[PDB]
Amino acid sequence: AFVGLSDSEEKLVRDAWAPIHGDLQGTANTVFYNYLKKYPSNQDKFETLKGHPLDEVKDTANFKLIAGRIFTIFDNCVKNVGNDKGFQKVIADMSGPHVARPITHGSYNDLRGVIYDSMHLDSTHGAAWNKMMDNFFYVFYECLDGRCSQFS
Ligand code: HEM
Ligand SMILES: [Cl-]
Ligand SMILES: [Cl-]
Ligand SMILES: [Cl-]
Ligand SMILES: [Cl-]
Ligand SMILES: [Cl-]
Incomplete structure (x- = not known):
């Protein structure tokens, strides 16, 4: 179920995200690369990337756009962490294009974990982060x- 974050947890999430927020596209590029490299079955789900070696597509416009739009959503969720309806709406709007897609919960959850590992959070910040991400996935x-x- 959806579980609201306290004011203090909201601050923890904003702080946890700040390094990524300040280098959003650069982080996106690296994290999205590491995700596709670690879990190679996922590259085929992206029709613009399908059929080419990962190292050939990593430097391309198509690739950076996809990585950017994933991170732009999380950046907007963080922006809306203190507004449950607003947070939900960010997710609601991005969810429609995924509904018909043959993408497993495993795949989404694998991406969540790559993001987590990249952040190297302490347990206080990680707890708040995981509250928000549990809401995100809910x-x-x-x-x-x-x-x-x-x-709605
Ligand atoms: C869970 C975090 C995710 C976020 C925030 C996110 C965000 C987005 C956004 C904003 C769009 C753009 C709208 C469009 O052109 O359709 C999109 C589309 C899409 N995403 Fe995601 N996504 C996530 C996870 C994933 C994963 C894990 C996969 C595949 C393994 C995936 C595959 C796709 C595909 C295939 C499209 C349709 C456009 C395209 O064909 O690339 N998404 N996503
Ligand atoms: Cl895989
Ligand atoms: Cl490859
Ligand atoms: Cl995506
Ligand atoms: Cl608000
Ligand atoms: Cl931390």
Whole structure:
């Protein structure tokens, strides 16, 4: 279920995210590369990337756009961490294009973990981060299951 963050937890999340926020596209490029390299079955889900070696696409416009738009969503979730409806709406809006896609919970959760590992958070910040990400996945998966309207 969705579980709100305290004011103090919101601050922890903003602080945890600050290094990424200040280098959003650069972080996105690295994290998205590391994700596709560690979990190679996922590159095929991206039609613009499909059929080419990862090291050939990593430097391309198409690749950087995809990595950017993932991180722009998380950046907007963080922006909205103190507004549950606003946070939910960010997710609701990005969920529609994923609904029909053959992407497993495993794949999404693997990306969550690459992001986590990259942040090297202490346990206080990591706890707050995981509250937010648990909310993120709650909403996202509700929307993938066609129960997106409950957040409206
Ligand atoms: C969980 C965090 C994620 C976020 C915040 C996110 C965000 C986005 C955004 C903003 C769009 C752009 C709208 C569009 O052109 O359709 C998009 C589309 C798409 N995403 Fe995601 N995504 C996430 C995870 C994933 C994963 C893990 C995969 C595949 C393994 C994936 C595959 C796709 C595909 C294939 C598209 C449709 C556009 C395209 O064909 O690239 N997404 N996503
Ligand atoms: Cl894989
Ligand atoms: Cl490859
Ligand atoms: Cl994506
Ligand atoms: Cl607010
Ligand atoms: Cl930390």
